[PDB]
């Protein structure tokens, strides 16, 4: 997270950290959506060019409070979207991981909500701000504490005009425009981390996106791209209700 601020204790209890098992290495962010399911970006688990093609046994996740009541969980199974397009533009950059054993919710561990039809049409509008969190780079090339930054969702036409990469309805972008004054952006390896919004209606936090890609970090005229969670909720259902 670039140009972000320190996160308060228990501010993002659904925050998950994805680690390489051997050798231990922080790979990506992720989010807890239930006591046994974790959402993340597909490119965090599958991206051959970066020699990433992980098996469930190659990874571990950490949840909860940052060296005692933290939670280390192994993975039972990994699910990557079958239409994830890593060769082109990262279309459908989404993956699911099932924990080997469900985790107990605590003051520091709780799931984020997934949006329903009415919610994504009331809050997923240009101008509205969401929140992204992560342990990624603080500058284009690391924090000692989880970082956070709130960013406005950007109108599609502006997103498309900001890059030559093909944008799909499965992505949205967010970040401040060059002259809005404020700054902020996610940065590698914040991928897999959640872009959440707090509903003023029921006071619940919903995950609207997943850190997916960007060109550089916090550059003027460019924006961060996120996997559109709601558009892919059907796949999440098939996978969860399938298995």
């Amino acid at each position: 997270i670039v140009e972000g601020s320190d996160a308060e204790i228990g501010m993002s209890p659904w925050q998950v950290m994805l680690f390489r098992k051997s050798p231990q290495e922080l790979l990506c962010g992720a989010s807890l959506i239930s006591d046994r399911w974790v959402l993340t970006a597909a490119h965090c688990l599958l991206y051959p060019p970066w020699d990433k093609n992980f098996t469930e046994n190659d990874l571990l996740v950490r949840i909860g409070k940052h060296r005692n009541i933290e939670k280390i969980s192994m993975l039972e199974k990994i699910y990557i979207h079958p239409r994830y397009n890593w060769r082109e533009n990262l279309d459908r950059d989404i993956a699911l991981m099932k924990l080997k054993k469900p985790v107990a919710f605590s003051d520091y561990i709780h799931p984020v909500c997934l949006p329903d039809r009415e919610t994504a049409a009331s809050l997923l509008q240009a101008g509205y701000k969401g929140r992204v969190t992560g342990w990624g780079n603080l500058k284009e090339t690391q924090p000692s504490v989880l970082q956070v930054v709130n960013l406005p969702i950007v109108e599609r036409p502006v997103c498309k005009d900001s890059t030559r990469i093909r944008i799909t309805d499965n992505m949205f972008c967010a970040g401040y425009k060059p002259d809005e004054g404020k700054r902020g952006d996610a940065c590698e390896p914040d991928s897999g981390g959640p872009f959440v919004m707090k509903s003023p209606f029921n006071n619940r936090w919903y995950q609207m996106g997943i850190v997916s890609w960007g060109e550089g970090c916090d550059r003027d005229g460019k924006y961060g791209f996120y996997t559109h969670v709601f558009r892919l909720k059907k796949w999440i259902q098939k996978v969860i209700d399938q298995f």
């Binding site: 046994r36 997934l114 969401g130 003023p200 969860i240």
Partner: protein
């Protein structure tokens, strides 16, 4: 609900409300920015 509780596990009913904030009626230091963004 959208997910069967048996595959999905615990959570779709207990989600998005933080024990240390919403549950204690405490606002975090920057969530008001999000609220402000909704208000025109």
């Amino acid at each position: 609900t959208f997910f069967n509780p048996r595959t999905f596990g615990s959570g779709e009913a207990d989600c998005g409300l933080r024990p240390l904030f919403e549950k204690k009626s405490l606002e975090d230091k920057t969530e008001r920015e999000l609220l402000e963004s909704y208000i025109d």
